Symmetry: C2
Subunit: 338 residues, 2 copies
């Protein structure tokens, strides 16, 4: 089944249900996933209306870009020349700048393939938007298959050499209760390195660090508590997890991380070289999600992209987007209940 | 009565019916007007889906900007410096540049006042969009009365010094059929002067002209065919009308233009100083509207704004907008059937 409903402020809500009866929903407001249930269970963090996103937190579950993460001083060197993008967080560019693509209503088309439904969102990023050279014709496809697979496929073309490194901003919470800490979940990640943050400013510092000893080792499945009730100076800094993890094996084939709670689990797969893991260190913010105040560590992301920092640590990779070249990315969230 | 419907590609169709049974409809795509009927007959041009607009012609009935008209060489001078805007038509900047505001899905909130139904459309022009310094926060309100009054109230505020001068691109066709030329309409226009174009380039010349002794003289009501038939240099140039006409008296109180066909007539009020008139000189192009091939002279617009060309003819006014100041503009289309 497929059901289209009005989400508010002119936005649509596209909800898909598979043969397993698993539901899922997206909105054209920021090309996001609004919810994902399983037995009246929310496996993610979400609001009930567009207004909620615009008033409480516009990032949750959205497609964020053109550049995801922070960019020191909003500076970027394109084909030599220095460009300054919109400074969102102090002098930094946080997820594309002010009022970026997560706040825009994307047009969309749905394609019912039977065992899979795809909702293709499109939006054009004008030449110069937020300092970004262009224009960048972007599209984000959100599909749900009959065998519990949540897939995101990115595509982009630009008239001008530019930068492009978007990501999906979902937060998970198997407790289905925002007032419940993601503390109890087990995490597995095929990351042995990590990118430390210099300050509270949260920019990168320049290091790459062998996470081998350190509690930030989820190679072996281990509870979230280990990292939460921990003392690295890094965890203390961010008051949880607000770091970019680098993966050992590259390729869409591989499970790169696993989020599990009891019988229900969520597996990760990307095309990308990194997964930024943010564990909602909001403290007493307490954003309401379904009339339920979120708690510190109320959820966790798995933002798959090219690590933020590239600008300072080229070893990270190259976020540029050649004019005319077709950008592509694929990330997958596969839910299991074995 | 108020009715909302999906219009296609993620867009909505908002239809307002008055006590008189007159219906009007708008879209968030381009904050535009899709239709306006009385007695089962259209008074304007428009399509039946969002795709038609993006496919055949995205201008009709749309909100156009940030700057309505053509800017020679895309050049505008702001606060001392010179800026180059998106070059959309040759070296020109036509209607805000490529993939502008008329191409976007705006958000909206409906206000029902009974005898009046307001539909407020919102959109943020990001700093740097199509070369426009910014952020520009805009809202365009479309309302419809029990006394058949359609009004467009515009609003805007920028973070930086910029330029702003949008318009409403509606096309009327009192025949209710694109295949029937508007030649048969009566026009009355309170304008003594007009700004001539210099070439098929349609850029401005630098000249203001006294239209007394010309077929372009509409002070005293006359049939449209009088102008179409003219052998006036300009008329011949454009193959009809495609000029800004400078209104003599200014003020929202005055009827500046009246377009009539039989018992039906549209009166035009605005706070702006000029009216750009374009009689769809589409030759054999034959754009299909409602399955009807539009004829050359198959429509006529009334684009209320500051006359285009001020850049080369400062006499025309000043299009700038200073950071912080509130831009506002009001234009009204009123239906009488007397």
């Amino acid at each position: 089944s497929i059901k289209i409903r009005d989400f508010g402020l002119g936005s649509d809500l596209i909800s898909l249900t598979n043969k397993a009866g698993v539901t899922i929903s997206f909105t054209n407001l920021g090309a996001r996933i609004v919810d994902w249930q399983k037995d009246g269970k929310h496996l993610i963090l979400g609001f009930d209306s567009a207004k909620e996103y615009l008033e409480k937190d516009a990032y949750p579950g959205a497609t964020v870009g053109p550049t995801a993460g922070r960019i020191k001083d909003g500076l970027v060197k394109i084909s030599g020349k220095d460009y300054i993008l919109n400074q969102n967080e102090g002098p930094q560019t946080l997820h594309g700048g002010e009022e970026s693509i997560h706040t825009k209503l994307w047009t969309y088309e749905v394609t019912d393939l039977g065992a899979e439904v795809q909702v293709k969102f499109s939006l054009v990023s004008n030449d110069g938007t937020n300092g970004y050279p262009g224009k960048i014709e972007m599209s984000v496809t959100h599909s749900f298959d009959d065998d519990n697979k949540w897939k995101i496929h990115y595509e982009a073309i630009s008239d001008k050499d530019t930068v492009f490194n978007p990501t999906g901003h979902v937060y998970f919470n198997l407790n289905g209760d925002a007032s419940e800490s993601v503390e109890n979940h087990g995490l597995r990640l095929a990351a042995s390195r990590f990118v430390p943050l210099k300050d509270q400013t949260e920019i990168v510092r320049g290091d790459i660090v062998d996470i081998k000893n350190t509690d930030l080792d989820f190679r072996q499945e281990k509870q979230l508590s280990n990292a939460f009730n921990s003392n690295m100076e890094q965890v203390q800094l961010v008051k949880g997890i607000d770091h970019p993890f680098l993966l050992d094996q590259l390729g869409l084939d591989k499970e790169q991380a696993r989020l599990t709670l009891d019988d229900t689990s969520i597996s990760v797969f990307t095309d990308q070289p990194s997964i930024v893991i943010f564990t909602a260190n909001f403290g007493d913010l307490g954003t309401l999600y379904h009339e339920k105040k979120q708690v510190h560590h109320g959820g966790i992301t798995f933002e798959c992209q090219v690590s933020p920092g590239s600008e300072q640590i080229p070893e990270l990779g190259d976020i540029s987007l050649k004019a005319g070249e077709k950008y592509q990315a694929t990330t997958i969230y596969s839910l299991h209940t074995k």
